[PDB]
Scaffold this active site. Structure first.
Site, PDB file in Angstrom:
ATOM      1  N   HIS A  41      52.516  60.283  39.529  1.00  0.00           N
ATOM      2  CA  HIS A  41      51.621  60.590  40.679  1.00  0.00           C
ATOM      3  C   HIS A  41      51.927  61.982  41.246  1.00  0.00           C
ATOM      4  CE1 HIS A  41      54.319  59.713  44.181  1.00  0.00           C
ATOM      5  NE2 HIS A  41      54.880  58.842  43.335  1.00  0.00           N
ATOM      6  N   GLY A 143      58.721  62.576  50.559  1.00  0.00           N
ATOM      7  CA  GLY A 143      59.573  63.370  49.658  1.00  0.00           C
ATOM      8  C   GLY A 143      60.712  62.565  49.036  1.00  0.00           C
ATOM      9  N   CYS A 145      60.184  60.041  46.963  1.00  0.00           N
ATOM     10  CA  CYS A 145      59.693  59.616  45.630  1.00  0.00           C
ATOM     11  C   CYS A 145      60.567  60.226  44.541  1.00  0.00           C
ATOM     12  CB  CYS A 145      58.225  59.971  45.440  1.00  0.00           C
ATOM     13  SG  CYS A 145      57.153  58.945  46.463  1.00  0.00           S
TER      14      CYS A 145
HETATM   15  C1  LIG Z   1      52.156  57.782  45.715  1.00  0.00           C
HETATM   16  N1  LIG Z   1      51.395  56.547  45.799  1.00  0.00           N
HETATM   17  C2  LIG Z   1      50.803  56.089  44.550  1.00  0.00           C
HETATM   18  C3  LIG Z   1      51.295  55.881  47.090  1.00  0.00           C
HETATM   19  O1  LIG Z   1      51.854  56.356  48.062  1.00  0.00           O
HETATM   20  N2  LIG Z   1      50.566  54.688  47.233  1.00  0.00           N
HETATM   21  C4  LIG Z   1      49.818  53.969  46.173  1.00  0.00           C
HETATM   22  C5  LIG Z   1      50.560  54.062  48.605  1.00  0.00           C
HETATM   23  C6  LIG Z   1      49.148  54.219  49.357  1.00  0.00           C
HETATM   24  C7  LIG Z   1      48.869  52.917  50.073  1.00  0.00           C
HETATM   25  S1  LIG Z   1      49.363  51.707  48.977  1.00  0.00           S
HETATM   26  O2  LIG Z   1      49.793  50.530  49.652  1.00  0.00           O
HETATM   27  O3  LIG Z   1      48.343  51.595  47.985  1.00  0.00           O
HETATM   28  C8  LIG Z   1      50.771  52.546  48.419  1.00  0.00           C
END
Ligand SMILES: CN(C)C(=O)N(C)[C@H]1CCS(=O)(=O)C1
Ligand SMILES: CN(C)C(=O)N(C)[C@H]1CCS(=O)(=O)C1
Ligand SMILES: [Cl-]
Ligand code: NA
Lengths: 301, 301
Positions: A41, A143, A145
């Site tokens: 991502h 950050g 991740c």
């Molecule tokens: C980097 N990444 C893929 C994410 O931060 N997400 C998928 C969050 C956004 C709301 S979620 O609950 O889908 C998780």
């Protein structure tokens, strides 16, 4: 004596952490031999994250698109590929600090140490259990991740977790180092929730054995029970079923204390029904479920 | 989000830990430059520990009575001296892994990371606080003497604790790295017991501010308190007095959350009267006092 939530010494992993930038996203990478591992991502804009086509977004990228910094030094990316939800950046130089390591997938109920990192900089270390609902209760900000989870077995680091995102309840979701998610999650801005969690029964009993070894003994009783009887109490209280495999793993601790697992299940049965009657066990008012039998034996023997 | 007891990355300390033997006694030493720091009690035998005359025991030693060992390498001792309750062994080799370091003595309520070690090998890392009675609630088995406590604020390692001994209540006593004990304790096997321990009020308040930051408001109330009324109540629960200093230190968390320090004191007063009524704050069913105002800001948004 004493009993504390204890992480593994993080030095062998601190020497693997780098910073990875792609456009206006910076996050953490794991540098082993001549590869850097990070969440895929990283290639995604806020627009892209709503419905990413990772195949297509990635062929459009090139080595020069990925900025990799080990401390104050740049790493030349000379190749890139994707394994599942993990990006693999080949670099010009093999990490001189690569430890003996393995990639491992852990089971629900098992623990590991998290090295929380920011801009490739190790920030903190804490112990987590992989919940039955396949989340972890970590401490992560923007950050973080690409921070990793691991165990150490003599000299060998077994890497088992890479952090990807946070779910709306404040709990955390990630992959193994082969990029397979723990739990029914996707690396995409979509509607996602953690399933209802269950208590890790074998870990609670491990912790009661730790309590006894440390002279906290009030909860013990003269009674005993059976799997079948207890497991009907467990299910009612959102406790994982206790198997014969679990009872055998606790054998070393049942011996060391003279409380047999179903003996201790008797104490545990009573704590669920009647509560703690206002006492503490190892300075907790909750029944702690994030210590394994290994964790207890390791620390108390 | 999330909130965890989080230790500093242990790597810079791991590269400093060695094994020190004298007679039949083995414990841990801290190798910084050409000096290995260890507890002076390492030179004691069975009889000596009741009334050791350390000056008399050390004059009778030569450099070659001390077997020092960095992993496999024997370090050759060329000099020894005592500073308070710490032995300083001079070695022929400067430790190439020596980080930027300093020695600081901490006050009650301050937190640090412990790197628990056995036979010079790091075993685990966890967070402790210096209790108001100058003990720490550690996890220390036989062999762990010489394990150290440290902070790492901005790439420099501040050593603040070396572990010497366990008290009969199962709590831990040690020195700063200048060999001065925290508290009234001594390195001889005599009838010493910790003072009655109290709760670190400033830390509990900081943790409640952490709970609000992480989206919890259930324990707030419409009340305030004078500082003096708060102290007359809190001391009836064995809480430390809260001082104007402590009020000043919480100013930033006050401003970030919009909750005045004395309003949060009114919430703490109520929680002590009521308990939690089957709720939890940041994963706990008790009021946590081992997070400082500085730790809350490091870990939180
Ligand atoms: C980097 N990444 C893929 C994410 O931060 N997400 C998928 C969050 C956004 C709301 S979620 O609950 O889908 C998780
Ligand atoms: C190695 N050493 C000096 C110790 O273990 N002690 C002094 C402890 C024995 C019980 S005590 O409370 O006197 C402390
Ligand atoms: Cl301090
Ligand atoms: Na029993």
């Amino acid at each position: 004596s004493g009993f504390r939530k204890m992480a593994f010494p993080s030095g062998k992993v601190e020497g693997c952490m780098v910073q990875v930038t792609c456009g206006t996203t910076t996050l953490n990478g794991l540098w082993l031999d001549d590869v850097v591992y990070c969440p895929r991502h990283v290639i995604c804009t806020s627009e892209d994250m709503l419905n990413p086509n990772y195949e297509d977004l990635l062929i459009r990228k090139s080595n020069h698109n990925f900025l990799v910094q080990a401390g104050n030094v740049q790493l030349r990316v000379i190749g890139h590929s994707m394994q599942n939800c993990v990006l693999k950046l080949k670099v010009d130089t093999a990490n001189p600090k690569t430890p003996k390591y393995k990639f491992v997938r852990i089971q629900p109920g098992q623990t590991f140490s998290v090295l929380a990192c920011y801009n490739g900089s190790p920030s903190g270390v804490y112990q987590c259990a992989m919940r039955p609902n396949f989340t972890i209760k970590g401490s992560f900000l923007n950050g973080s991740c690409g921070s990793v989870g691991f165990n150490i077995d003599y000299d060998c680091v077994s890497f088992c977790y890479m952090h990807h995102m946070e779910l709306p309840t404040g709990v955390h979701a990630g992959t193994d180092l082969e990029g397979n998610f723990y739990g029914p999650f996707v690396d995409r801005q979509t509607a996602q929730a953690a399933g209802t969690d269950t208590t890790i029964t074998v870990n609670v009993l491990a912790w009661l054995y730790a309590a006894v070894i440390n002279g906290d003994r009030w909860f013990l009783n003269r009674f005993t029970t059976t799997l079948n009887d207890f497991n009907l109490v467990a299910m009612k209280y959102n406790y994982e079923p206790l198997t014969q495999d679990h009872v055998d793993i606790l054998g070393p601790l049942s011996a060391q204390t003279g409380i047999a697992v179903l003996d201790m299940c008797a104490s545990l049965k009573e704590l669920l029904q009647n509560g703690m009657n206002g006492r503490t066990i190892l300075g907790s008012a909750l029944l702690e479920d994030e210590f394994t039998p290994f964790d207890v034996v390791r620390q108390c023997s």
